[PDB]
Structure 1
């Protein structure tokens, strides 16, 4: 069973799309641990969608990737970044494209934080 993360299902989908795309550009983000655990499976599924490289997988990925600029002074979108860099980087590796490393609790609410990175 998946987590609800205290959000509405539409808010869950929007926050997961935002975190997935933001991980895809910035390559290392710092969230809470349960958000990391919910995010990593979706991110490796989208990397698996990028592995195929065909038009139908790209149109599947376009329904999830938000339209933010990936690489500056190149006009590269994130959707181009999945099919240009991440898929060619993880061609040999079969799964496990992300790892989660825990940090200490947050000051304001005691939230256990985690580092997410593409490996």
Structure 2
């Protein structure tokens, strides 16, 4: 199933479209736990479009990646970073692009933080 995450069906899209972009810039995020486990199901679809590289394939991926400059001084968008960097690295790999490592809970709410890293 999917996860409701306490957000409205439009709030989840703005939720997930941010976090998938932030894996492109940061290479790793410390979300909460079910914000981690529910993020890997989208990015491993989104990196799958990276390996294609069609003019049709990029225009599917722009609906989950926003307009944010990723590397300074090269002026790359996060859309550009998938097809230039990430796809050139995962031509060996078939699935399982982002491993998830659990960290301990958080102080102010007891929420289980979790670390996502791509791999």
Question: How many residues align structurally?
Answer: 119
CA distance in structure 2 between the aligned counterparts of 1:24 and 1:44, rounded to whole angstroms:
12
CA shift for structure 1 position 14: 0.4
* 1:13-38 deviation digits (Å, cap 9, x = unpaired): 10100000001111011001101111
CA distance in structure 2 between the aligned counterparts of 1:61 and 1:86, rounded to whole angstroms:
14
Gaps of 5+ in 1: none
Runs of 4+ in 1 over 4 A off after TM superposition: none
Between structures 1 and 2, the one with greater helix share? 1
CA distance in structure 1 between the aligned counterparts of 2:108 and 2:24, rounded to whole angstroms:
27
SS in 1 for 2:7: coil
* 1:41-97 deviation digits (Å, cap 9, x = unpaired): 100100001110110010000111011111110010000000000001111100100
CA distance in structure 2 between the aligned counterparts of 1:80 and 1:91, rounded to whole angstroms:
17
SS in 2 for 1:45: helix
CA distance in structure 2 between the aligned counterparts of 1:43 and 1:25, rounded to whole angstroms:
13
Backbone CA RMSD of aligned residues? 0.6
CA distance in structure 1 between the aligned counterparts of 2:114 and 2:51, rounded to whole angstroms:
27
CA distance in structure 2 between the aligned counterparts of 1:64 and 1:85, rounded to whole angstroms:
18
Gaps of 5+ in 2: none
TM-score, normalising length: structure 2: 0.98
